[PDB]
Structure formats: C-alpha cells, structure tokens
Amino acid sequence: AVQIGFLLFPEVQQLDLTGPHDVLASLPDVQVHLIWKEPGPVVASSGLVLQATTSFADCPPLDVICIPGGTGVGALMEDPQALAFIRQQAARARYVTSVCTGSLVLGAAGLLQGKRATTHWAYHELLAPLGAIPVHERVVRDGNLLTGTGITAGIDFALTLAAELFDAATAQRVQLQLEYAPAPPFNAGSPDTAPASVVQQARQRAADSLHKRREITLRAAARLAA
Amino acid sequence: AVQIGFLLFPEVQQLDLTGPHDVLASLPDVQVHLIWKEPGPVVASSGLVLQATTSFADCPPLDVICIPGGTGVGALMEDPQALAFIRQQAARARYVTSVCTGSLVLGAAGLLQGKRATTHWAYHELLAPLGAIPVHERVVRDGNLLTGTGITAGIDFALTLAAELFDAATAQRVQLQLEYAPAPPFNAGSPDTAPASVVQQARQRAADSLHKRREITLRAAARLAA
Ligand SMILES: [Cl-]
Ligand SMILES: [Cl-]
Ligand SMILES: [Cl-]
Ligand SMILES: [Cl-]
Ligand SMILES: [Cl-]
C-alpha cells in the first residue's frame, strides 16, 4: 500500500489535516497514519480532539508526508524530535508536503534551504530566514516538495497527488464521489482580494503571534546555520 | 454564546463535519458541540477517530444544527432517538443545515416535507419519497433550512451563516484568516462536468449503497406517512 502520513500535533489547525486526509483515504491501496510521539489523543486549536495512530518510532517509511499548520507550529519549530523525524521521512518520501504554516516546520527542519515555497500570508516573511525562496502563489512545487496555503490547499494537492500516484481518472472519480466543487460566498481569501479594512483587522489580530514567531524563527535559523 | 451543534455519528464523512466546524469555531462568542448519544469516541468512515463532546440529553438549545453525511446515514435514517433529537432541536433552531447525504437524515426526521432541498448527486432520487421538492443545485435555502452538496459544502454556508449571525466583514475576516481561496486541479465535481466514463465508474461503485438506501428510505417514508 502507499503509505501516507500526517503529523498530528497539539494546537494543529485540524482542517489543514482533515481535508487532505479524507481525500487521500478515499484511494485504493493506501494506508493513512496520524503521527505523533505516541498514539493517543491530540487536541486541535479549536478544541476538537483527534487521535494519533502511530508513534515516530513505529511509523513505516512514508511515500507521502504532510505537515499541517496551526498555532501549534510555534512549538513544533523547536521540537528536535519532530524535526528529526520529518527529515528522516523526507529523505525517501516521493512527496513532502505542507499546508499553511506547516511549511515553517519544514523550514525549521532544514528542508526549505534553496527551495521555492509559500506559507500563510501573514507569516510569509518568515520563509527567507529559513533559507527558502519565498513565492506568493497558492501552491508551490519544487522537486518533491509541495507547499500550499488555504484550507482546501491540501484537498487540491491531494487530488494532484492522487492523479500522479494513480491516474487522472482516479483523481476525477474521487472528486466526483466527494461532489467537491467549492464556491465561496465571499472573495476575501487572499490579502490581494479582501477589503483593505479586513486585511488590517487580520494583521492586527496576528501581530502578537507573528512577533513570537519571529523570535522562534531566528532560533530555528541559528540551528540551521550551525 | 451562540450554540452550534454537529451530529457526530459512526461512519460519518468527517470532512462534512470538520470543514464547517473549523470555520464556525473561528467566530467570537460561539460554542461548538459534537453531539452523540454520549460523549466519547466516534469513528468516521475513513477510520479517523473523533470525540463527541455532549450527549443528546445534555445538549443546550442550538442556534445552528448541522447534519453531516456519510456511509453512516443509512443507519441514522432509522435511529429513532437521533431523529427525534434532530426534530426537537430543529423546532427552535435559527438555522437547520446539512451536508451531502445529511439531508436524507433531515428527510427521515420529517423536516423536508414540502421543503426544497438537495443531497449527494448519486442519492438525489431519495429526496422526493421523503416529501421534499428536489432541487439540483449545490446549495438550497428554504427559509431557515440550508442543504448543501459536496464534501466541503459546509465551509461555504458556514461563511454565509457567519455573515448573518455577525456581519459581512466578520465572515470576510474569517475567510482571510483561513486564506480560503479554493482552486481544484480537476473539473469533475459534478456529474454534469465530469467525464461520462467517470460518472459511470462512480454510479457503479454506489449501486449497492443506493439499493440499500432505497429500502431504508421507503421504511423511513412509511413512518412519516403514519
Ligand atoms: Cl483554500
Ligand atoms: Cl464542494
Ligand atoms: Cl467579498
Ligand atoms: Cl464508532
Ligand atoms: Cl477535469
């Protein structure tokens, strides 16, 4: 079976994970893992309780690894066990992927050095200190690396991955079975299309988190510079 | 606080629940419940383990109720306790909503009689026996009833609900914070746009489930006819 793994950490943004999980779990001959330090409950940033299925030590070699984002990314960027596990898996994985601020975890792990990548718009300035070439695009592919932003990015690149792992007809079948055709009632999903007043409110609400993440990012970068 | 409740049942299609959950949980002064017969683990059709937070008896009066879909809908259409709970909450809820085959549960509960509604394309013929006026549209609103199609239908109508519960700027802010700017890599999310061959693979794969659900629907309709 194709082995697909999501990192499941405290304060994950659960939809970053649960979207691609449901798409990829629809495919034949796949096994999907939710990975943490040990199996058991892990609480998402909303309070929704998820369950990790495998420990780092027991996880098989993965064909696909996916790092979701969320407020828990800050701690994960300085979790040496988690970063080492991600590096080990990335060394052999066909696909290394992330959603939203999950790419900052890839960055802290050293996996974005010289690589084109994106992240959540409010945190995009944190890519360059981690060695990345920052790109303002919703999905960015560099070799075996896909980084995406948005709560359907992982669903979308899951359909791309499905087409490459299997074939286009299989990806189309999953899309049709899920009747997946988003049609948002507003056009505020990018800082370039949202009203300026909404952008400002979002920036102000993110300011304390960004400040703390600047500090974390600098320590993570120092470890890479060593 | 505004009380929002999702029915969490065995064999749910978890993304039908987890999408709108993460959107609505981003709003101020909301409380979001995952409802089942008692708190504890409930397993989605993919094998993902979720946790119900409240029992039927302890659930507060809901301002929004949302019924997700999934394999597990068949059993729920003949679960008298669940159907009666849905009816009791729907009687006083500001909004009664469903995703995908969750509308078949609303139908079995008697809540679609004379109402315009949609459901998953492969099961759409089951609406009329439940008293509904079937509508081939991705979202269908009849008063305070909203039924949507597609595994991510609930994210979108969650943004509509956010705008009506609060204001448009709040919904736009949540959209921007989540960087929700969907962009599927294929155009097969409707039987009207997917390749005819893919539509057939999907119809054939659904045939046994539809057959079983025709039987269930007829029994559910008989209970309404009494
Ligand atoms: Cl998105
Ligand atoms: Cl959809
Ligand atoms: Cl807008
Ligand atoms: Cl269960
Ligand atoms: Cl297509």
Numbering used by the authors:
A (entry chain B), B (entry chain A): 2 to 227
Provide the authors' own sentences about this structure as they appear in the paper.
Our enzyme of interest is isocyanide hydratase (ICH), which catalyzes the irreversible hydration of isocyanides to N-formamides via formation of a cysteine-derived thioimidate intermediate. ICHs are commonly found in pseudomonad bacteria and soil-dwelling fungi and likely serve a defensive role against isocyanide natural products produced by competing microbes. Asp17 is catalytically essential in ICH, where it is proposed to act as a general acid/base. In addition to its intrinsic biochemical interest, ICH is a useful model system for catalysis-activated enzyme dynamics.
